[PDB]
Amino acid sequence: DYII
Amino acid sequence: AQKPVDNITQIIGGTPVVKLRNVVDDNAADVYVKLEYQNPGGSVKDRIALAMIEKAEREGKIKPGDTIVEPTSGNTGIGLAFVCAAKGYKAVFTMPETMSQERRNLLKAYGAELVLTPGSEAMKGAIKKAKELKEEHGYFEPQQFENPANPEVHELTTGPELLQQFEGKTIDAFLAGVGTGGTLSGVGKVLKKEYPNIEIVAIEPEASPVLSGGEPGPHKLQGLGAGFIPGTLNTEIYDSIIKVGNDTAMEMSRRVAKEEGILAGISSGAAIYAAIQKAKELGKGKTVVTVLPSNGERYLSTPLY
């Protein structure tokens, strides 16, 4: 999933 | 060189700007890149980590020694870990168990505690667990996708730095990848005010084009593509959106390292690719600016390099  | 400071957080900001020479043609606009990996913690997220902690301190929501919590597998966790170590706070991060051992080692090197959530649950599981921990334990949650100090610090620091750097020049287009949207929103507000004819352009992954109206999906542009429209994104700030594919972004980051000597992350290759596309449209003599959020050294174990 996202890497923020 | 800066006079000595008592705390490393006093060197966050004031990042340099380099003009590109080789990956863009002499027929296109000039393209300039702001090196946000020159912040002392290594990414743009030093700015929002400092700002969110300092605002909560100034509002009495936290005091030195307190523990904060944030769900993050990326540069915001590194930023918050760095700032908390520098300012005397304790940090807890939640994240899916798919995060690399080296990335874990980096957060723990600053003294942070990690709470790993099921890999199959991805960020949803980490968000759920951070909220649970916040309510059980009284932790402060910065909330990078909602906290207004995120776009506000870009309105106060990153944006106005650019105005100083481009004095006596007109910026014709500013482009930025959207993760939280704080960079695009705060820089864009300041630049639109000073340069009312500027175009402001959002960049997002082709594979998860939620700002374009499409569906979220898995993608590899680290730092971008939250899969939703963040609270911290002003959806009115941009005039257009450029979608970038996984492979396109990685090919550009490789070109820029080899041909400009600028070694940056995947999201930087997406930003530069979009900025070159915009520069070709605007043609010679015009000025295009974008931001490079993170350094290529943080990606040596990914397919990028």
* Domains of chain B and CATH, by start: 8-42+148-299 (3.40.50.1100), 62-137 (3.40.50.1100)
Q: What are phi and psi of B253, to 5 degrees?
A: -60, -35
Q: CB–CB of B122/B134 below 8 Å?
A: no
Q: How many helices (H) and strands (E) does chain A have?
A: 0, 0
CA distance B276 to B269: 11
| Cα dihedral value B200, B206, B211, B217, nearest 10 | -150
CA distance B73 to B147: 18
Tokens 């798919």 belong to B98
Smallest Cα distance from A3 to chain B, Å:
5
What six digits make up the tokens of B286?
Answer: 């015009």
Q: Which B residues, 222 through 241, put their C-beta within 8 Å of a C-beta on chain A?
A: 222-227
Amino acid at B138: G
Three-state DSSP string of chain B: CCCCCCCHHHHCCCCCEEECCCCCCCCCCEEEEEEHHHCCCCECHHHHHHHHHHHHHHCCCCCCCCEEEEECCCHHHHHHHHHHHHHCCEEEEEEECCCCHHHHHHHHHCCCEEEEECHHHHHHHHHHHHHHHHHHHCCECCCCCCCCHHHHHHHHHHHHHHHHHCCCCCCCEEEEECCCCHHHHHHHHHHHHHCCCCEEEEEEECCCCCCCCCCCCCCCCCCCCCCCCCCCCCCCCCCEEEEECHHHHHHHHHHHHHHHCCCECHHHHHHHHHHHHHHHHHCCCCEEEEEECEEHHHHCCCCCC
DSSP secondary structure letter of residue A4: -
CA distance B275 to B143: 30
Resolution limit in angstroms? 1.5
Is B96 in CB contact (< 8 Å) with chain A?
yes
Cβ–Cβ of B122/A1 closer than 8 Å?
yes
End-to-end CA distance of chain B: 32
CA distance B209 to B197: 26
Q: What are phi and psi of B249, to 5 degrees?
A: -65, -45
CA distances from residue B202 to B25, B178, B212, B223 in whole angstroms, order as listed: 23, 6, 10, 13
Active site residues of B: 45, 267
Experiment used for this model: X-ray
Amino acid at B207: A
Q: What are phi and psi of B94, to 5 degrees?
A: -105, 145
CA distance B216 to B236: 20
What six digits make up the tokens of B183?
Answer: 């960079």
